[PDB]
Design a protein around this nucleic acid. Structure first.
Ligand code: MG
Ligand code: MG
Ligand code: MG
Ligand code: MG
Ligand code: MG
Ligand code: MG
Ligand code: MG
Ligand code: MG
Ligand code: MG
Ligand code: MG
Ligand code: MG
Ligand code: MG
Ligand code: MG
Ligand code: MG
Ligand code: MG
Ligand code: MG
Ligand code: MG
Ligand code: MG
Ligand code: MG
Ligand code: MG
Ligand code: MG
Ligand code: MG
Ligand code: MG
Ligand code: MG
Ligand code: ZN
Lengths: 135, 175, 136, 130, 102, 38, 94
RNA sequence: CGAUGUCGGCUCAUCACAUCCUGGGGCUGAAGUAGGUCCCAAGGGUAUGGCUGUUCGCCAUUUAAAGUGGUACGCGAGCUG
RNA sequence: AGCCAGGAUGUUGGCUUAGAAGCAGCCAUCAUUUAAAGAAAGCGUAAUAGCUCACUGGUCGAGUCGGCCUGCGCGGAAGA
C-alpha cells in the first residue's frame, strides 16, 4: 500500500529539495522517515543512496525494510568516474573488467533474485555496455 | 447467430407463454410481453427457449440473436429485474422522489419534474444518488438516459447527472 | 520540375493517347507505382509525387522517375479569340497509358514503399497501383 | 506457437517427467506474483534452473503428454492443476513447501493432490527422508 | 517582416465607363493586401484579366513603396542620430592614441 | 463532428458504423475523431 | 515440382485468345527441340498461383497435355499491362 | 439588325440557399462571457445618411442582422433621365 | 472476441535541463528472473507519483483474420 521508492543519497538528512511533496503526500510526516533513515545509515557508510520499502499503514506506524545500494552508483565507483557516457557507441569513455564485475555481483547477491551469479554478472555487463563501458 | 445459439433457461416460477411471434413472460417481479419479428422462430424446450431463423428470411440469424438477447433480458427482468444508479455531481444538485415523480434540482431556474413510466420505481439513498429499479431493461435504460439528459455531465468538472459506472472524461481549460 | 533541356521543335500537335504503355515491368527498383488509368502527368504533378515519396522514405533508398514530361502543352491567354496562331507553351506533360511504370523505388521495405507510393499517388491525376519486381 | 515449438515443449515435459520422479501441483486462482517469485527462488536456491512453474496442464497438452509414463496424471487435466518436477534426490522436501504456499494467503485452489508419486492418498504426507 | 502574399481580388465595374457594354460589364479589378491595408483598383485595360494582372503588379509595387518609405524613415532616423549626440556625459571614456582603458 | 467525403479511422478507438445509410466514425477516446460522411 | 494441366488449343488467333482470357484461361506455347511447337490453353488461376513462386521460373516444369507429360521451362511470360494476370507463356522443352 | 431600349435610381417584387440575424445541433486550442469552425434549417426579418450618375466603395451613425445570388445582371407599353 | 493475472531486475540508463525518474529532447536502445514484459506505445506529473498497452498465462470451445480479383449498390451530390 503506497510502497514507493523515492529517496536520495543518505548524506542529506531531511532531503526536502530533491523529493519534497512526494515523501509527504499523505498524513505521513517528514521527520519519521528521516529518523528511520539515519537510524539505518548508522550501520553503513555515508553518502550513498539507499532504497527502502514503505507501507504507510493507518495506525501511523510504517514498516520499512531496505535494499542494497544501487548498482548504478556501485558501477560508478567501479569506473572511478562521474559521467558515464553520452553518444556512447561513437566514442569509448572507459574500459571495465569481467572479474571485478563478478566482485560487484557477488556482494549484492542476497538482495537480487539470482541464484547463479554468472547471470547477474552478464546483467551488469550489459548495464555497463549501455552505460558506455565496453568490457 | 452465435448469440442465438445459446438457449435461454427459464428458472423456477417463470411462466413463459409463446403465441406466434408474441411472447409473454411472467415472473415474481412482473410481466413483460414482446412481439418478435416474423423472421424469428422461437421454441420452448421443457426448461429453455431456443431461437433460430425461419426459412425464407435473409436476416434470420441476426433477428434471432436480437430475439435471444431480448428474451434473456426479459427473463432476468421478471426474476430479479434491473437497476440503474445515477448520481448527481455539482454543488446544489439533488434529487427526491414523490411516489413516481423524481424532483430534480440541477441549477435551473425551474423545478425539473421527471415522471416515470408504469414499470419503473425510483428511490434516493441520498440526495445525490438516484437508484431506479424496473423489470424492462430498455425502459430503465431509457429513463436513466432521460434523467442524464436533463443535465449531461460537463467535461470541465464532470458536473451533472451521470451514471455511477460511467467515467466522465475531464478536459482542462488551457491558459 | 522536369523539362527537356532543348527541344527540336517548340510546339507540338495535340495528338492522341490511345494504346497500352511500354515501360510495364519494374526495371530498376524493387517496387513500382504503375498507372492503371490513362492521361497525362504534368511536370508539376511528377515533381509533387516525387517530393511526397522522397519525404515519406526519409531520403533513404533510391527512386527512379520512369516518365519524363516531353510534350509541350500550349494555352491561349485569357480573353483571346480562336485564331491568331498556336498558343504559348505553358507546361510539359508525359502521356501515360495504362500499365506505365511511373516511379520505381528500392532500398526500403515493402511496407514503407507501399506507404510512400500511396502518398505519391494521392498527388497524381491518373489511377495507379503498386507493383513489385517479377523474376521474368 | 506453431506445432513444431509445441512438439519441442511436449518432448521437454516428457523428458522432465522421465528424469525426475517427484513433483508437486499448484493452481493459481489467487496466486500472487509474490508467492510465485518465492516458489521460483525456492527452486533456484535449492538447485539449478531446471525446476519450472510450467503451466502446460491442458486436456490435450499435459493429458496428451502423460501416456508416456505417469499415466495417472491424465485424470488431473481437468480444473487447471499445474506441475513442478523435481529431478535429484530421493523424495525431496518441496512437497510441503506448496502446503505453506497455500497456507500463506492463497484461496486454496490448488487442493494439493500430490499426484500420489508413491501411490499415496491426496492428504499431505509429512514423512520424507531426513 | 515580409508580409505574406495573401492578395484578395474583387472584380467590379469600372469608373468612368464610356459605353453600353462597359456600363454593363464588370472589368475593373480591386485588389487588397490582407494584414497590410493596401487596396488598389486597376481599370486601365479593356478586360478583367489584364486589370487583374496589373493589380498583382501594383500590389507588389505598393508593398515595395511601403518598404521604401519604411527604409527611408530609417535613413532619416539614422542621420538624426548624428545631431542628437550630446558631446558630454560619456558612457565610456578612452584616453591616449591607443584607447588605453574602458 | 467532421463532415467529410473521406471518413477514416483516426486512432485505435475509432469505429466505422453505417447509421441510416451514412458512414460515420464514432470514437470513444477522442470526440475530435467523431466523423460523418457527407 | 510444378505440374501444369493443359489442353491443346482447338482454334488460334486474336479472337480465340480473347475468348480464352475471358473464360478464365490463357494461351501458351511449348516450343524448342525438333518437335513442332504445341499451342496450349492453361487455367489462369492455377498458373498464376504457381508463378507466384520464384522457382516457377527456375525449376523444370511438367505440362500434362493429352495425358502426356512434357518437361519444359518457362521461357517468357506476357503479363497483362496493369492487372495481376498472365496473357501468354512461352515454355521451352527441357 | 422590315428595332429584343442600355447603367444607376425609384416603385413593386419573386425565387434559390452556398444562412447575415433569429431557431436547432456537433467539435473546439469551448471555464464563464465572448468566440472559432462545421452540420441542419429559407418561417420571418434583414439600415439611414455624407461623397459620387454611379453599382461598388470609403466614411458617419445605427441594427438582432444590415446575407449571397437568380429573375432580359427582374422591373422605361410602370416612373426618372 | 470478451472475461481472470502478471506485465518485473539492472534502472530512477546517463546528460542539458530549472527539474527529466519510459514518455521535454539526444543517443545507446542492451543485458537478467524468464509462461512475459518495450531503457518503453498511449494516457497521467512540476519530476515523480499513477492508469491502460505490447507480450504472456488462465477460462470458453468452432471457426476466425485480412489481402486479392470481381458483379451490383452507398456517400461524395448545393439553385434560383
Ligand atoms: Mg495520328
Ligand atoms: Mg507510347
Ligand atoms: Mg466612345
Ligand atoms: Mg458584355
Ligand atoms: Mg435520424
Ligand atoms: Mg458538405
Ligand atoms: Mg476483333
Ligand atoms: Mg438587332
Ligand atoms: Mg418585327
Ligand atoms: Mg444548408
Ligand atoms: Mg457552434
Ligand atoms: Mg427569404
Ligand atoms: Mg419564404
Ligand atoms: Mg417553403
Ligand atoms: Mg409552420
Ligand atoms: Mg446575372
Ligand atoms: Mg436589368
Ligand atoms: Mg437582383
Ligand atoms: Mg417592362
Ligand atoms: Mg432605365
Ligand atoms: Mg415590354
Ligand atoms: Mg443626360
Ligand atoms: Mg482471447
Ligand atoms: Mg456512388
Ligand atoms: Zn479515434
Amino acid at each position: 500500500q503506497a510502497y514507493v521508492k523515492l529517496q536520495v543519497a543518505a548524506g542529506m538528512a531531511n532531503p526536502s529539495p530533491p523529493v519534497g511533496p512526494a515523501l509527504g503526500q499523505q498524513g505521513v510526516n517528514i521527520m519519521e522517515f528521516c529518523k528511520a533513515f539515519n537510524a539505518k545509515t548508522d550501520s553503513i557508510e555515508k553518502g550513498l543512496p539507499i532504497p527502502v520499502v514503505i507501507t504507510v499503514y493507518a495506525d501511523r506506524s510504517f514498516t520499512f525494510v531496505t535494499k542494497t545500494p544501487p548498482a548504478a552508483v556501485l558501477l560508478k565507483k567501479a569506473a572511478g568516474i562521474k559521467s558515464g557516457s553520452g553518444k556512447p557507441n561513437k566514442d569509448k569513455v572507459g574500459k571495465i573488467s569481467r572479474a571485478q564485475l563478478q566482485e560487484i555481483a557477488q556482494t549484492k547477491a542476497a538482495d537480487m533474485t539470482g541464484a547463479d551469479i554468472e547471470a547477474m554478472t552478464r546483467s551488469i555487463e550489459g548495464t555497463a555496455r549501455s552505460m558506455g563501458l565496453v568490457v | 447467430s452465435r448469440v442465438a445459439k445459446a438457449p435461454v433457461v427459464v428458472p423456477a416460477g417463470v411462466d413463459v407463454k409463446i403465441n406466434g411471434q408474441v411472447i409473454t413472460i411472467k415472473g415474481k417481479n412482473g410481466e413483460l410481453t414482446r412481439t418478435l419479428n416474423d423472421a424469428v422462430e422461437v421454441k420452448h424446450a421443457d426448461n429453455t427457449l431456443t431461437f433460430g431463423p425461419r426459412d425464407g428470411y435473409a436476416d434470420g440469424w441476426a433477428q434471432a440473436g436480437t430475439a435471444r438477447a431480448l428474451l434473456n433480458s426479459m427473463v432476468i427482468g421478471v426474476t430479479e429485474g434491473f437497476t440503474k444508479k445515477l448520481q448527481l455531481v455539482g454543488v446544489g444538485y439533488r434529487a427526491a422522489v414523490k411516489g413516481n415523480v423524481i424532483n430534480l434540482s440541477l441549477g435551473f431556474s425551474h423545478p425539473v419534474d421527471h415522471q416515470l413510466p408504469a414499470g419503473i420505481t425510483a428511490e434516493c439513498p441520498t440526495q445525490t444518488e438516484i437508484v431506479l429499479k424496473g423489470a424492462d431493461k430498455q425502459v430503465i435504460g431509457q429513463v436513466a438516459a432521460d434523467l442524464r439528459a436533463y443535465r449531461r455531465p460537463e467535461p470541465y468538472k464532470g458536473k451533472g447527472v451521470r451514471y455511477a459506472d460511467e467515467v466522465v472524461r475531464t478536459k482542462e481549460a488551457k491558459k | 520540375m522536369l523539362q527537356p533541356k532543348r527541344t527540336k521543335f517548340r510546339k507540338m500537335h495535340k495528338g492522341r493517347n490511345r494504346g497500352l504503355a511500354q515501360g510495364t515491368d519494374v526495371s530498376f527498383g524493387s517496387f513500382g507505382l504503375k498507372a492503371v488509368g490513362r492521361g497525362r502527368l504534368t511536370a508539376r504533378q511528377i515533381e509533387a509525387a516525387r517530393r511526397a515519396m522522397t519525404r515519406a522514405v526519409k531520403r533513404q533508398g533510391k527512386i527512379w522517375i520512369r516518365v519524363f514530361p516531353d510534350k509541350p502543352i500550349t494555352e491561349k491567354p485569357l480573353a483571346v479569340r480562336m485564331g491568331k496562331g498556336k498558343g504559348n507553351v505553358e507546361y510539359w506533360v508525359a502521356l501515360i497509358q495504362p500499365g506505365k511504370v511511373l516511379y520505381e523505388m528500392d532500398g526500403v521495405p515493402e511496407e514503407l514503399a507501399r506507404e510512400a507510393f500511396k502518398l505519391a499517388a494521392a498527388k497524381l491525376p491518373i489511377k495507379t497501383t503498386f507493383v513489385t519486381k517479377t523474376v521474368m | 506457437a506453431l506445432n513444431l515449438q509445441d512438439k519441442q515443449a511436449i518432448v521437454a515435459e516428457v523428458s522432465e517427467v522421465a528424469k525426475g520422479a517427484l513433483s508437486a501441483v499448484v493452481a493459481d486462482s489467487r496466486g500472487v506474483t509474490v508467492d510465485k517469485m518465492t516458489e521460483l527462488r525456492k527452486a533456484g536456491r535449492e538447485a539449478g534452473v531446471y525446476m519450472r512453474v510450467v503451466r502446460n496442464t491442458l486436456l490435450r497438452r499435459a493429458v496428451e503428454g502423460t501416456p508416456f509414463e505417469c499415466l495417472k496424471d491424465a485424470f488431473v487435466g481437468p480444473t487447471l492443476i499445474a506441475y513442478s518436477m523435481e529431478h535429484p534426490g530421493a523424495a525431496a522436501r518441496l512437497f510441503k513447501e506448496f502446503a505453506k504456499a497455500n497456507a500463506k494467503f492463497e484461496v486454496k485452489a490448488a487442493a494439493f493432490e500430490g499426484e500420489l508419486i508413491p501411490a499415496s492418498q491426496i492428504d499431505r504426507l509429512a514423512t520424507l527422508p531426513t | 517582416q515580409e508580409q505574406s502574399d495573401a492578395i484578395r481580388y474583387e472584380t467590379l465595374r469600372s469608373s468612368g465607363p464610356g459605353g453600353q457594354h462597359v456600363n454593363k460589364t464588370d472589368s475593373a479589378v480591386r485588389a487588397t493586401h490582407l494584414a497590410s491595408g493596401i487596396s488598389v483598383k486597376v481599370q486601365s485595360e479593356r478586360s478583367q484579366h489584364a486589370n487583374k494582372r496589373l493589380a498583382r503588379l501594383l500590389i507588389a509595387w505598393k508593398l515595395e513603396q511601403q518598404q521604401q518609405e519604411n527604409s527611408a524613415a530609417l535613413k532619416s532616423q539614422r542621420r538624426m542620430f548624428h545631431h542628437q549626440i550630446e558631446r558630454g556625459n560619456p558612457r565610456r571614456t578612452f584616453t591616449g592614441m591607443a584607447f588605453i582603458e574602458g | 463532428m467532421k463532415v467529410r467525403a473521406s471518413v477514416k479511422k483516426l486512432c485505435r478507438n475509432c469505429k466505422i458504423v453505417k447509421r441510416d445509410g451514412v458512414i460515420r466514425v464514432i470514437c470513444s477516446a477522442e470526440p475530435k475523431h467523431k466523423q460523418r460522411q457527407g | 515440382m510444378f505440374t501444369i494441366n493443359a489442353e491443346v488449343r482447338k482454334e488460334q488467333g486474336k479472337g480465340a485468345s480473347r475468348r480464352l482470357r475471358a473464360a478464365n484461361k490463357f494461351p501458351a506455347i511449348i516450343y524448342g527441340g525438333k518437335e513442332a511447337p504445341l499451342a496450349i490453353e492453361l487455367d489462369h488461376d492455377k498458373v498464376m498461383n504457381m508463378q507466384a513462386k520464384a522457382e516457377f521460373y527456375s525449376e523444370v516444369l511438367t505440362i500434362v497435355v493429352d495425358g502426356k507429360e512434357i518437361k519444359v521451362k518457362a521461357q517468357d511470360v506476357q503479363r497483362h499491362p496493369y492487372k495481376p494476370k498472365l496473357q501468354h507463356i512461352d515454355f521451352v522443352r527441357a
